[PDB]
Design a protein around this nucleic acid. Sequence first.
RNA 1: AAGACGGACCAGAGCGAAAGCAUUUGCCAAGAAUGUUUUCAUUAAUCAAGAACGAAAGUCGGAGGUUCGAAGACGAUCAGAUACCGUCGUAGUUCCGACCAUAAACGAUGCCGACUGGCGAUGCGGCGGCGUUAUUCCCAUGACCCGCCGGGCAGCUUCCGGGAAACCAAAGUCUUUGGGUUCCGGGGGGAGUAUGGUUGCAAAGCUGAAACUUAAAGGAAUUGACGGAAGGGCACCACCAGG
Lengths: 215, 84, 99, 126, 136, 64
Amino acid sequence: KKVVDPFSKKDWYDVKAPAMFNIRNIGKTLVTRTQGTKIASDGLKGRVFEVSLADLQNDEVAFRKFKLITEDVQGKNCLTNFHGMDLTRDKMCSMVKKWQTMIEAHVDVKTTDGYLLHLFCVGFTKKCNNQIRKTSYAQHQQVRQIRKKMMEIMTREVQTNDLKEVVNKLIPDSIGKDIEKACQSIYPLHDVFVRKVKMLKKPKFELGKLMELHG
Amino acid sequence: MPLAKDLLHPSPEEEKRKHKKKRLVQSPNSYFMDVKCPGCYKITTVFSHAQTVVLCVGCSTVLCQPTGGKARLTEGCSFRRKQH
Amino acid sequence: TKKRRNNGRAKKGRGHVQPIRCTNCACCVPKDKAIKKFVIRNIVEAAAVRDISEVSVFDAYVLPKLYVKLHYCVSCAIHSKVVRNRSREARKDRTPPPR
Amino acid sequence: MGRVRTKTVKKAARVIIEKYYTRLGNDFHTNKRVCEEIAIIPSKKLRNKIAGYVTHLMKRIQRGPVRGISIKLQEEERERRDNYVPEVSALDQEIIEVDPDTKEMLKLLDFGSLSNLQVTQPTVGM
Amino acid sequence: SLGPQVAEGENVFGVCHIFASFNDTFVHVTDLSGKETICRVTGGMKVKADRDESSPYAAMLAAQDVAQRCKELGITALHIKLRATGGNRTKTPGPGAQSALRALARSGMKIGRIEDVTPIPSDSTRRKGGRRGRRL
Amino acid sequence: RVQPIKLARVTKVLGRTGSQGQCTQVRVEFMDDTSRSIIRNVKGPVREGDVLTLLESEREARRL
RNA sequence: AAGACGGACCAGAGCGAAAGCAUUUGCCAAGAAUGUUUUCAUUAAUCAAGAACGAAAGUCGGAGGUUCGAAGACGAUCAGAUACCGUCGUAGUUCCGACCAUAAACGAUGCCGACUGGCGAUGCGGCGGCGUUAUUCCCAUGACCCGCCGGGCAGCUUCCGGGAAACCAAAGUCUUUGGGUUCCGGGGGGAGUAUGGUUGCAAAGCUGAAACUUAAAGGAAUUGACGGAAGGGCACCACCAGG
């Protein structure tokens, strides 16, 4: 019954990523016009774009996703900020495999900036280099202490440094690598990755930083 | 076993590998030893499975550390049972 | 007399277990007295993929897989031939069909 | 499809091939006549099936002995051919590396040799 | 509105957002954020039959019809988000999902990545149906 | 919806499927394209090297 | 926001008397195994009464009801459906203090000790190596490999021995009959019914007959026949394409 013809009233915007990447023009998206009869500032600056980090960076990965949130719109350019990094689903499930020990650690941490982040981690005990066991297991005590190391490093390196630098570290997983090394004395481990980051509280008083990141 | 053996004087490697109360002549293999160790200036007698640490006047603390099995020792040491 | 020694998969050294459900018949069955089946399959399968690989551009990425851990109840698992009747001699083997 | 050979034919064929090897040819027509001479076969269709299979056998046979059948003369020839000498036994192999326990086996037999030492990356062969 | 600056001379990317259930397969492409559509043609739309909404032909027809209108608005490329039923339910995609992908690929949409986005819980809450249930 | 008519020539008769055994699998070289080569089921008796006139590659014809 | 739930990882793997028990971290006390020329010096084995715990549903009073859902009411399918199947949804699921005391509470196998047989795993502890890898300057760590020894869940293969067999290193050491102790059975039905007592708010739980009926009730293996159970073939008395 009831239709409208609405693709004649929409305006085009160029979604801009930070200048902390080599590809800044993610692509374009059309939103409804913001005006006093039909309101769309809500539907424009509430936008969260789920983009693959490979397309955003110019490449290193072809898994991984960044959530980009519009923190302001300036002249049909929409300036995005970090909201989270996940590993999609495919990558994450492929790490989880039978006959191993799945180690989970999660932490809640305040950054130098205003932002509260919940950062989940994952790790796996390896099949080592002369092992004739199929399965990889250890005492409960071990795994518990491995988790404490994991949690401590992850909090310490995110507590320090601004949100962007935290991001820049977590892409090559230098935090990850430090965990692997500190745990290597116990069980060597294979993997160690941040599997989810959930932005819990996002305040804006950092239009300064927002402009600094772009350009 | 090939099921017809009779052993009246059994070898001490198939009687010395077994559990302490499962031995065919039962005496444990535990012993005492003299520990010299250099930060201690006296010759402290110590029990092979000491349990709780042995300490001495001559050392600050360096003599034993506890372990559930054989007691841990530090630096130069000797052992002679002697005669169990 | 016992027609299955393990009773379709054992629960020895364990006093009770929680029940899992069937993924296509939804009925309660013990988790380790029922069929458990890993399903790793391509996202674009053997179907879509032929035109999806040719049409793709600006891409270099090996295909995702969907991972789902199915659980089937006995009556459904026999029916749709996940497992099927076998010789009584053959039952004493824990060795299953290779994947 | 149809009219696969029966046991009666094959048995007779084995018989004939072994004892009349030199006489037999490889041509159906001549072999058919030879089967009249060396046997009494009460039907021509039966004799033809026998003769037929015997040519097929002779063809395989004259590449050396083949599956399920052998002729005595060919057996003698293979026997003689196999005089094969693959060592002479010890090579000699004296004073080479041997396992550390195989070493004590030689040692307490009044020999000894050079011997392997050290264990690196066990499990062994892995 | 029309295209961005040209309707076919640049690659503008959106998200496919295919919900594969059984007894339907919704194709329903959206703008990269997710907060505005682009086309709304269901698997029941081209052929409504109440059982052919997930049979390959309907799915094909629909995905081609979507792909048309997509490249008419300057969206000439797509990152694919396949999705199953999800939740504490069957979480298996229907058979009209593969045919739809192949159909839009053929039509003239261009592909750039493929990711999985299926939502799987820890078996939060409870599953539908009683204990004896359907017996097969 | 619509595609152009494709002539495709029988490369290899794969074998017979069907419940009654009266459907024959065939692989047809797409003829226009040597890159494509796709499996379509033929109802009739098939002699290799004869030519089908495919009106679709939609609605894939397959074992049953 | 509410209420619920902790996948994949998770196994003939662990722990707990059993019932039972998987998100992170901390606290509280408890238990086993192991090591042990420590201590006591027979303190022990097993069991009427008596006592502790005890899934699920139900019942008492609240919280709570997201999810799903005994009843009810609806749509189909069936000759019949009141069922399975779709929908709506009640008590209930969840949580707290009380009841209740049973489950195929199944390993259908009392508990304790001794003796009798091969081989390889694995959770865990300890011990040993001119073994590997790993960290601090190397270590002492730890994971791993090999060997050894305990106590776990099991497996495998065996004229070890049993059994009616199926099976079973115990269901073995039973006519060559006897280590300790406890419990229950004496053809099948009537019947966990009758009856009295007892416990429970209730629902229910425990003890527990007879008349009469009847030469089979039952177990196991074997062979056939049959299956809308699973792998197969073959035929125009079958189908196909068709006349």
